[PDB]
Nucleic acid binder design. Structure first.
Ligand SMILES: [K+]
Ligand SMILES: [K+]
Ligand SMILES: [K+]
Ligand SMILES: [K+]
Ligand SMILES: [K+]
Ligand SMILES: [K+]
Ligand SMILES: [K+]
Ligand SMILES: [K+]
Ligand SMILES: [Mg+2]
Ligand SMILES: [Mg+2]
Ligand SMILES: [Mg+2]
Ligand SMILES: [Mg+2]
Ligand SMILES: [Mg+2]
Ligand SMILES: [Mg+2]
Ligand SMILES: [Mg+2]
Ligand SMILES: [Mg+2]
Ligand SMILES: [Mg+2]
Ligand SMILES: [Mg+2]
Ligand SMILES: [Mg+2]
Ligand SMILES: [Mg+2]
Ligand SMILES: [Mg+2]
Ligand SMILES: [Mg+2]
Ligand SMILES: [Mg+2]
Ligand SMILES: [Mg+2]
Ligand SMILES: [Mg+2]
Ligand SMILES: [Mg+2]
Ligand SMILES: [Mg+2]
Ligand SMILES: [Mg+2]
Ligand SMILES: [Mg+2]
Ligand SMILES: [Mg+2]
Ligand SMILES: [Mg+2]
Ligand SMILES: [Mg+2]
Ligand SMILES: [Mg+2]
Ligand SMILES: [Mg+2]
Ligand SMILES: [Mg+2]
Ligand SMILES: [Mg+2]
Ligand SMILES: [Mg+2]
Ligand SMILES: [Mg+2]
Ligand SMILES: [Mg+2]
Ligand SMILES: [Mg+2]
Ligand SMILES: [Mg+2]
Ligand SMILES: [Mg+2]
Ligand SMILES: [Mg+2]
Ligand SMILES: [Mg+2]
Ligand SMILES: [Mg+2]
Ligand SMILES: [Mg+2]
Ligand SMILES: [Mg+2]
Ligand SMILES: [Mg+2]
Ligand SMILES: [Mg+2]
Ligand SMILES: [Mg+2]
Ligand SMILES: [Mg+2]
Ligand SMILES: [Mg+2]
Ligand SMILES: [Mg+2]
Ligand SMILES: [Mg+2]
Ligand SMILES: [Mg+2]
Ligand SMILES: [Mg+2]
Ligand SMILES: [Mg+2]
Ligand SMILES: [Mg+2]
Ligand SMILES: [Mg+2]
Ligand SMILES: [Mg+2]
Ligand SMILES: [Mg+2]
Ligand SMILES: [Mg+2]
Ligand SMILES: [Mg+2]
Ligand SMILES: [Mg+2]
Ligand SMILES: [Mg+2]
Ligand SMILES: [Mg+2]
Ligand SMILES: [Mg+2]
Lengths: 33, 128, 160, 224
RNA sequence: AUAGAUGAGUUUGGUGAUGGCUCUGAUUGAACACU
RNA sequence: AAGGUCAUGGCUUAACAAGCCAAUAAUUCUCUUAGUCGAAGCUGAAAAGGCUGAUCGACCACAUUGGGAAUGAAAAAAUCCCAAGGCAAAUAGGUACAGCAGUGAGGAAUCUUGGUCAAUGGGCCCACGCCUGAACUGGUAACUUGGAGGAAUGAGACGUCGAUUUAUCGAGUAAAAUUCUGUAUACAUAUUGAUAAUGACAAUAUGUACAUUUGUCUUGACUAAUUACGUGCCAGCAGUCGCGGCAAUACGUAAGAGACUAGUGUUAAUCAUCAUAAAUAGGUUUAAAGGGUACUCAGACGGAAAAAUUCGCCCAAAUAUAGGGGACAAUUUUUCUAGAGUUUUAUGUAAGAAGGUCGUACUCUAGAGUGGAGAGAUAAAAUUCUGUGAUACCUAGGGGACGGGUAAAGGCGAAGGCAAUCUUUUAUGUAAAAACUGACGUCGAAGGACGAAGGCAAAGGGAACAAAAAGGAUUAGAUACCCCAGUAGUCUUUGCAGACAAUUAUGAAUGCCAUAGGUUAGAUUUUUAAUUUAGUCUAUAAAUGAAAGUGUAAGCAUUUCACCUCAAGAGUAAGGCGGCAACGCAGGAACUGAAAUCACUAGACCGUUUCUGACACCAGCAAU
RNA sequence: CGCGGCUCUGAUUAGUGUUAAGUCGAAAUACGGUUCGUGUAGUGGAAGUUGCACGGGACUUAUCAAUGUUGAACAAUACGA
RNA sequence: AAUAUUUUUGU
């Protein structure tokens, strides 16, 4: 896999890792950890 | 793959491809009847330009699809019973259907001289 | 086993591909069977078993090998004479069919079809120059020999 | 694949087919090249076929999986061991020039080593001692050392006379009014002078050069 | 049953690959439009 | 042991025994979907082909839904009993058209409320005969197939039409006209479907008579077939690529042209195309795709020379009785040493672990040391340090972690990874000969173990470095890059965690293919210098590859495991499992597309290297 | 009647696809102007950026201070660009 | 030999 295409996966995994933090407390209230 | 890997079921069907007209392809029907919910205009994508006449239709099965109105000029409006057939507007997203012009309520182009079968236009009967 | 014939098919190709005059093969009852078939078919020049070093080429046929007992059986080896004509090897391809993972057995009714350029089973028709060797009760014969003797058996390899 | 498809061995097969028929269908084929019939019955030789090379030494019998079965082997004779023993005992025998340029190859036809060291066509050198030693050691059944001594002493008696001739031949020529040129001892010394002088020029130049480096180390530009 | 095995358009500045999509062939207990 | 049975079987019973089947899902459970099958239909050149599961035949199930029994040789019922809802009915206690025709509804869409029991079949009957919505016949629909649907002559009406070159290019042998046929069909006659007799209805043969419609798609390329005008990214066309922005062969008209024809197109679907899930028959260095690792249970595969058994395989079928042939195959037996192992302290070696230490630098404390105004930082500075005496130069005590040279394309371990030193401790591997065991082998789902840095948990340690937090600068702005300082953390011990560009972007292993130049640890020798075993690294041949390149393999072959099937969504959602948490394992679909993607070639660019020209620049003079 | 499954819907709320013509920056591709990516842990409106170890899909892109030699005289009938 | 100020955008 080229480096240009690897950066497409890099942006997807970061925005997801960044999303699971923001909604971590909300998922803890509903018992969805 | 080794003969053993094939014995355990490694050969699986290929991932399905979406049909051009799912509402018709799913139930193996060539056409369906629907009540026109809205007659508006859709704009093509980057290359093409213009105002494509479309119609939001609620099929008999229950699906709400968007069909394309072929020809020049139509006479359908809200609460119009129209016949939907497969097809797709290659430049309009979501417009994955066509409307038969010799259909129940949709009339054919009266000023059409070529390809009348495609637009539901009776012969002029000039001499007759 | 059939694994030995597969190794023999690959080596004979690599030797012909390298344009070698002589070629060595492990001395086994199965290898000698196919070797005699290749020689009887006209692909190799001669077959003589000897030690780890090739016999004297000047007296290849006249070579008198020593008895094969348990004191030297681990060092014996079959020395094959390869053939080259018109700037092209006579044993170019030795594609095998029956591999250790699967043994392909053919019937007389099918070999009669494969012998005339028509597929039958997991085999394909034989074209000009091609040749198919079959291991049967009467030894490792050729598809045209087995068809004459009216027998089937185990398909070993296809020679071009 | 940096190579190219060379079809030099099939120039006849190719030319024979191109000359069999005519491109213009309906006409007889024109005459073939003038060389097509000359080599009609002289096919090429088989090339690119690795045979079992000639074995100049008994191959290792204990090897179970021997390699290099298509590698030319080294040519070693029984004389190679004798040449090394002699020339090592007589290192300065190599300074005596020896010509290895053959005239017609027919030098081993007049060599009869049963007569002595002096043979026809070849000079008296360490080889004559070796060939004489090998003969006695084989024919007369002598040992390596015994034959070596006999063949070695005959070599000295012949070399001694050679050195005695140079001395007497010169002394004899001057007794009747015979003068010669510059001997090798004098010429050799004159050459050393021309070279020694050139070295002196190089020494004085570098020596003076180093003085500048020694003075340039310290600084005295102020001129106090 | 011994005549039975075939391709085309389309990614690129361009070439050669890879890999889809579409057309070419046959058909329906078919429907619709014009007849 | 006994009974039972033609016979066999816990089939049955009594007394003892603790077994039998399976371990990779036997067994059991939930969800989704479906009547099953056939050269029966469709399709492909073909595959143990693919799809469908109409009409035909066989099988299964059901007759409003649910719950049940009896009769009978046999439930094999549209029967019978019971409950509920709909219609009907009330003291009643029927009906369910998935029997034929038909009506309503639903739907894109599928027919007559006919005649006869004459034929074939069935039920009842001594017989005659009665009954039959099966069945046979008529009707409706181009739904499909098959056939008809008109042939020959036709040149001066010396006309007409459309183009244009008034004579060129066409309509055009086309038409009219003439000469023949009597096709579908109509009517008549006869025979036949049926014979003991019975004809609802029609077929067949012969005779005579009649010359009866065009429709539709396409016309940029794929794809056979052209111009004109109008329109002007508008209107529209499009299966794919695309066309349309004022002289459009692509849109809409007109004409011409190409083709199929009572059909023609379009939509939907299936096969083939597609080796596009590749058993036949694929592939994974850089394009989708090699698991982090290899010890290993199951499971696949795996030597030599003989023998028994199976009679596998072959003759060779028809799912072939009984035989023959013995190479190969399965189980098994006896031998063999080429694979794999053991012994003989190898050499060499940063695999690993325990207990200890060494040293250069750093840092802390003290000596009211010497010295007495700066130091450090950065491109430059600022925050900061220093008169409570710093930096610099020393003395004496500590305190933690680090590992200079040697050092190499070097080496060691399954990988991760391992580099100061001493003792202790641990498994492989390599060379040389001898000896020994005698196929004991390779791969290996799963489980288990190991697994970098960072991280969590607990207690220590804390010099240095440094996420965080914080400040000073830079800058249009600056969270940043730079700087002054600085907490977790890095280190030790005990657990959790299991993700990596865990890489050779290349799984492990076996057999095999031509050379050269270095290099590592050994061995042999005429130890000088050449052979040789096992590794590693460059450059090549044959070859291979899309090429780059590889060439101890990305070659020729084989074994086995993992993994891939267009892009994107997505390694995401949901349920579940593991974990203290962080997160990991496993793992879709909808929506939107015709492209994504790889190597190479030639250029251009580079706050890219080295050069070559030019008042381009430097310098000088003049000017704006 | 209870438990479990399944379908629809739900204030509020999240992600992603598409859409030439908006705004804010300039992260990648050249040494992309702080080497880029992998893992992990923080952090910032966003792309990004920071610590720690790791990979090259980046530096094999490598090209002399060993400065390069009176290596056996001369003359002869030998030798003759 | 160990040097390093800043420099965004283009329907
Ligand atoms: K047998
Ligand atoms: K002080
Ligand atoms: K090793
Ligand atoms: K610091
Ligand atoms: K663990
Ligand atoms: K080597
Ligand atoms: K999702
Ligand atoms: K490079
Ligand atoms: Mg990849
Ligand atoms: Mg498109
Ligand atoms: Mg037209
Ligand atoms: Mg059209
Ligand atoms: Mg490009
Ligand atoms: Mg391809
Ligand atoms: Mg069903
Ligand atoms: Mg059913
Ligand atoms: Mg009915
Ligand atoms: Mg009903
Ligand atoms: Mg309806
Ligand atoms: Mg009847
Ligand atoms: Mg009857
Ligand atoms: Mg009767
Ligand atoms: Mg007639
Ligand atoms: Mg009757
Ligand atoms: Mg054309
Ligand atoms: Mg294109
Ligand atoms: Mg047009
Ligand atoms: Mg017809
Ligand atoms: Mg790997
Ligand atoms: Mg794993
Ligand atoms: Mg991985
Ligand atoms: Mg038998
Ligand atoms: Mg034994
Ligand atoms: Mg032994
Ligand atoms: Mg061994
Ligand atoms: Mg040791
Ligand atoms: Mg003081
Ligand atoms: Mg210490
Ligand atoms: Mg590593
Ligand atoms: Mg070191
Ligand atoms: Mg293993
Ligand atoms: Mg495992
Ligand atoms: Mg850790
Ligand atoms: Mg830790
Ligand atoms: Mg802690
Ligand atoms: Mg700041
Ligand atoms: Mg550690
Ligand atoms: Mg690592
Ligand atoms: Mg593995
Ligand atoms: Mg190495
Ligand atoms: Mg190489
Ligand atoms: Mg290959
Ligand atoms: Mg995907
Ligand atoms: Mg996963
Ligand atoms: Mg999840
Ligand atoms: Mg280039
Ligand atoms: Mg100027
Ligand atoms: Mg100036
Ligand atoms: Mg002015
Ligand atoms: Mg809502
Ligand atoms: Mg960056
Ligand atoms: Mg940038
Ligand atoms: Mg950068
Ligand atoms: Mg990074
Ligand atoms: Mg910060
Ligand atoms: Mg780069
Ligand atoms: Mg731009």
């Amino acid at each position: 896999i080229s480096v240009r295409r690897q950066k497409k996966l890099k942006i997807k995994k970061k925005k997801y890792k960044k999303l699971m933090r923001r909604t971590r407390n909300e998922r803890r209230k509903q018992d969805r950890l | 793959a080794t003969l053993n890997q094939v014995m355990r079921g490694c050969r699986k069907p290929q991932r399905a491809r979406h049909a051009v007209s799912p509402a018709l392809s799913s139930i193996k029907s060539p056409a369906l009847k629907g009540v026109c919910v809205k007659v508006g205009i859709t704009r093509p994508k980057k290359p093409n330009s213009g105002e494509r006449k479309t119609a939001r239709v609620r099929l008999s099965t229950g699906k709400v699809i968007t069909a394309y109105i072929p020809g020049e000029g139509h006479n359908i409006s809200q609460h119009s019973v129209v016949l939907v057939r497969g097809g797709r507007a290659q430049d309009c997203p979501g417009v994955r259907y066509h409307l038969v012009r010799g259909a129940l309520d949709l009339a054919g182009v009266a000023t059409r001289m070529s390809s009348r079968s495609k637009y539901g236009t009776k012969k002029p009967k000039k001499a007759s | 086993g059939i694994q030995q014939i597969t190794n023999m098919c690959s080596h004979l190709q690599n030797a012909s591909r390298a344009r070698l005059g002589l070629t060595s093969l492990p001395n086994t009852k199965y290898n000698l069977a196919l070797a005699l078939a290749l020689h009887r078919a006209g692909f190799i020049s001669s077959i003589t078993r000897g030690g780890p070093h090739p016999p004297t080429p000047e007296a290849l046929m006249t070579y008198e090998p020593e008895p094969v007992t348990s004191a030297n059986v681990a060092t014996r080896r079959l020395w094959v004479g390869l053939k080259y004509w018109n700037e092209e090897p006579v044993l170019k391809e030795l594609k095998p069919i029956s591999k250790p993972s699967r043994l392909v057995t053919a019937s007389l009714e099918q070999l009669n079809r494969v012998a005339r350029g028509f597929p039958a089973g997991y085999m394909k028709g034989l074209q000009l120059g091609e040749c198919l060797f079959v291991n049967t009760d009467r030894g490792v014969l050729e598809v045209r020999e087995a068809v004459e003797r009216k027998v089937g058996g185990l398909v070993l390899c296809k020679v071009k | 694949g940096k190579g190219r498809i060379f079809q030099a061995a099939k120039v006849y097969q190719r030319a024979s087919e191109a000359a069999a028929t005519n491109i213009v269908s309906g006409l007889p084929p024109r005459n073939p090249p003038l060389w097509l019939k000359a080599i009609e019955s002289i096919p090429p030789a088989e090339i690119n076929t690795r045979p079992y090379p000639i074995q100049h030494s008994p191959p290792n019998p204990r090897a179970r999986k021997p390699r290099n079965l298509f590698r030319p082997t080294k040519i070693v004779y029984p004389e190679d061991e004798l040449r090394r023993d002699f020339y090592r005992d007589h290192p300065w025998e190599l300074a005596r020039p020896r010509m290895i340029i053959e005239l017609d190859g027919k030098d081993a036809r007049f060599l009869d080593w049963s007569k002595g060291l002096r043979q026809r066509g070849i000079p008296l050198s360490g080889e004559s001692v070796v060939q004489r030693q090998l003969w006695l050691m084989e024919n007369q059944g002598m040992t390596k050392q015994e034959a070596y001594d006999k063949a070695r002493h005959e070599f000295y008696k012949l070399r001694q006379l050679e050195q005695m001739e140079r001395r007497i031949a010169v002394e004899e020529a001057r007794m009747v009014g015979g003068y010669f040129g510059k001997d090798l001892l004098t010429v050799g010394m004159e050459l050393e002078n021309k070279t020694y002088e050139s070295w002196k020029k190089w020494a004085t130049t570098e020596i003076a050069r180093q003085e500048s480096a020694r003075a340039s180390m310290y600084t005295n530009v102020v001129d106090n």
